[PDB]
């Protein structure tokens, strides 16, 4: 199939700062991936983003009942839906699961990577650090970044490039919004 | 900010595909099945505390289809440039042998939202217990998707996620083995 395609997207966005103390509502329209007209609650009217959306801003802004219902969306839509799902979205917190295991960069060679696998946590913001004999190791640390599993959990593999010697204690420290104290896991050769 | 709730919709010609879904901080809350006209919560626990009228969603898709035909005329029938995806294969949990796990195929940064993807075991296709999310919106206004495959890690088996897209000149295969 070689027929050309034509995509149209619409995104109704609610932005929240400090609970519902500050709310921003955006009503965005896209042709393919190019936004051409939007409504910004901080402006109170439709504004065309590209030349393509000028007919829409003119026509929509002439309707009084449309602008008024778009200006109340922060309360009739944004603040309403927040309280509906505030229990299982805003307050969802899943404890992370930390595993430390060794790996190899090239096969058939001794271990040279210490992998700290943090799994299944929510929310996404996380701080994972390595320590060697009590001193933090900030040199030669690679990671996968923060991975969204798509099922309302996250994971990240923070790897340490090092050849472990006997008598060395390596510690992976994990900080998370749902934790009261930093979670640490030791690993010794 | 602190949190973002996005109600994302799209309509695609000439495939006549549409979609209605709610997004929270990059995660799917629910999506409306356009066929059976039902609300599909991403996790079953969500439907207990909240309800959604699936009938209201189909109205926006009707307006979306009409708008698209207006914009297609305005753009003098300028088609969409296909953007090929990135593909990555990961496990949900660290691997142990004879310990159940889940493969995740992550298809990201592509448009239009049409894709053929298939799980392979040792070269043969698998459709057993396979699940997938619907097309999820991004903030550069491309798309991203997830495919899941529960499996038991063994030394004898080998897994690939093959993705097909109009922006790729060959079916992109992403490999996983223990």
């Amino acid at each position: 199939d070689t027929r050309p395609r034509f995509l149209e997207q619409v995104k109704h966005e609610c932005h929240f700062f400090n609970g519902t103390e500050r709310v921003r509502f955006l009503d965005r329209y896209f042709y393919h991936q190019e936004e051409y007209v939007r409504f910004d609650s901080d402006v109170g009217e439709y504004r065309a983003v590209t030349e393509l959306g000028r007919p829409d801003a003119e026509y929509w802004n002439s309707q009084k009942d449309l602008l008024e219902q778009k200006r109340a969306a922060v309360d009739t839509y944004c603040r309403h839906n927040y309280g509906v799902g505030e229990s299982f979205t805003v307050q969802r917190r899943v404890y992370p699961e930390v595993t430390v295991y060794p790996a190899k960069t090239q096969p058939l060679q001794h271990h040279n990577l210490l992998v700290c696998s943090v799994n299944g946590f929510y929310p996404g913001s996380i701080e994972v650090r390595w320590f060697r004999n009590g001193q933090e190791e900030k040199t030669g640390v690679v990671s996968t970044g923060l991975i969204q599993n798509g099922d309302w959990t996250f994971q990240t593999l923070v790897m340490l490039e090092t050849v472990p010697r006997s008598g060395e204690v390596y510690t992976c420290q994990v900080e998370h919004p749902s934790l009261t104290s930093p979670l640490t896991v030791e690993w010794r050769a | 900010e602190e949190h973002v709730i996005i109600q994302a919709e799209f309509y695609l010609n000439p495939d006549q595909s549409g979609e209605f879904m709610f997004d929270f901080d990059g995660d799917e809350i629910f999506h409306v099945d356009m066929a059976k006209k039902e609300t599909v919560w991403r996790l079953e626990e969500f439907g207990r505390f909240a309800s959604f009228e699936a009938q209201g969603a189909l109205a926006n898709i009707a307006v979306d289809k009409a708008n698209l035909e207006i914009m297609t005329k305005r753009s003098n029938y300028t088609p969409i440039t296909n953007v090929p995806p990135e593909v990555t294969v990961l496990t949900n949990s660290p691997v142990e042998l004879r310990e159940p796990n889940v493969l995740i195929c992550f298809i990201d940064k592509f448009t239009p939202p049409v894709v053929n993807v298939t799980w392979l075991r040792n070269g043969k296709p698998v459709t057993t217990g396979v699940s997938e999310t619907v097309f999820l919106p991004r903030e550069d206004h491309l798309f991203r998707k997830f495919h899941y495959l529960p499996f038991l890690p063994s030394t004898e088996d080998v897994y690939d996620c093959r993705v097909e897209h109009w922006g790729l000149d060959e079916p992109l295969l992403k490999h996983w083995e223990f």
């Binding site: 839509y77 | 009228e53 926006n60 914009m71």
Partner: peptide, 13 residues
């Protein structure tokens, strides 16, 4: 207990 949708507008033909 019910989520509310926000309305898509119709462009001028």
């Amino acid at each position: 207990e019910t989520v509310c949708p926000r309305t898509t507008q119709q462009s001028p033909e």
